[PDB]
Amino acid sequence: GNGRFLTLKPLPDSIIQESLEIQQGVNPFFIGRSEDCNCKIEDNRLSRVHCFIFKKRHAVGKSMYESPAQGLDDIWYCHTGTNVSYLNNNRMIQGTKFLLQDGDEIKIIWDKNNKFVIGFKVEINDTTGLFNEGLGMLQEQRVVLKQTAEEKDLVKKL
Amino acid sequence: EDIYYLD
Numbered sequence: 210g211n212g213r214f215l216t217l218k219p220l221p222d223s224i225i226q227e228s229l230e231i232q233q234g235v236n237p238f239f240i241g242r243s244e245d246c247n248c249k250i251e252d253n254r255l256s257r258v259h260c261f262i263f264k265k266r267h268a269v270g271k272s273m274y275e276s277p278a279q280g281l282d283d284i285w286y287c288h289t290g291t292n293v294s295y296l297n298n299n300r301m302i303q304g305t306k307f308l309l310q311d312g313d314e315i316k317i318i319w320d321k322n323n324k325f326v327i328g329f330k331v332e333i334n335d336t337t338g339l340f341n342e343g344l345g346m347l348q349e350q351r352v353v354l355k356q357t358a359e360e361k362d363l364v365k366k367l
Numbered sequence: 368e369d370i371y372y373l374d
Contacts (some may be wrong), residue, residue: 254371291371320373 215262215284215343216332217248220314223327226251233337237263237287237363240317245367252327254318258364259290261311262331267340281340284309284331287360292318295328301353307359308351310344 214233219225229248239246241259250259251295257366267283274361286309288294295316309315309331316328333342340346 245369256369292373318373 210335214333214335215309216334217262217329218332219250219327219329223329224252224325225327225329225364229329230334231284232264232336233335236293237261237360239364241290243367248329250317250327252318252325254320255327256290256292258287258367259292259317260286260288260294260303261364262286263306263360263363278346281338283340283345284343286313286315287356287363289356290317290366295319296321296353297351299351299353304356304361306354306356308343308345310343310349310351312344 212232213230215231218228235247238248238251239261240248241257242251242255243257262284264282264284267281269278269280286307288305289303291303294301296307311333313331314328318327336342
């Protein structure tokens with residue numbers, strides 16, 4: 210497991226039923242109808258750079274003792290699609306970032322009328338020196354944040 | 368085609 214850290218597995222319940230794994234070294238992982246997206250999702254509704262999972266160095270609030278957390282890396286899910294995505298219970302519009310916890314099932318597209326639903330389960334097998342792995346530590350904070358020029362630049366690579 | 372919309 211010197212190449213895979215995170216595992217995004219499209220479930221059978223979704224039009225997709227494959228397993229994609231982000232490499233501890235691949236950051237950010239791009240998702241969208243365009244295979245250019247490190248992750249592959251073919252949904253007529255999905256866009257080229259539908260969304261991407263980006264990794265960042267988790268910063269701690271100092272420590273005048275011996276406590277965990279420290280400074281390591283965290284994986285953020287960055288939605289770039291107009292069709293919006295659903296993560297557990299948090300909405301993310303094209304241009305948002307989100308914390309990805311170990312075993313996080315994210316839905317990129319859900320249509321009731323079409324009965325077609327897409328969702329991937331994030332499973333981290335390897336922890337490339339991750340403060341935890343991505344599920345955070347103490348008081349889970351699952352709130353959607355906005356992206357900046359840094360994020361927009363990442364999608365400008367493919 | 369950024370004219371999509373979901374319920």
